[PDB]
Design a protein around this nucleic acid. Structure first.
Lengths: 67, 63
DNA sequence: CACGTG
DNA sequence: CACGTG
């Protein structure tokens, strides 16, 4: 229940309530949560390393829950 | 654009054929590498500097 | 314009 | 690992 974990949870929750295969950008996420895109991306890539999220390469990249 | 100037001088004040890096310029100038580069790429497009190498890039006055 | 970078 | 980016 740390502040960083709360942030990770906020992002994971946002993406989970997105839908089946729907993805979103770091830009959108940053805007909805009121957090700078840099911090968001730092968390998104980190969570992808942990396997919880999948990055769909592109410009910009799209993010969603893994598998 | 005083910032641009300061960087511009420092660079012309460099040895004949010696090229430097944004990282080095940051330490040698006590300025964030973000602004350094912002200037470096601008001066390069403006033809006042030249960039070579790749990872990272090396900067020296243009001839 | 992708950029997350410690 | 480059990264300059508003």
């Amino acid at each position: 229940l740390s502040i960083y974990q709360d942030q990770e949870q906020r992002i994971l929750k946002f993406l989970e309530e997105l839908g089946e295969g729907k993805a979103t950008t770091a830009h959108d996420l940053s805007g909805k949560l009121g957090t700078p895109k840099k911090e968001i991306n730092r968390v998104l890539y980190s969570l992808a390393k942990k396997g919880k999220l999948q990055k769909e390469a592109g410009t910009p990249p799209l993010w969603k829950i893994a598998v």
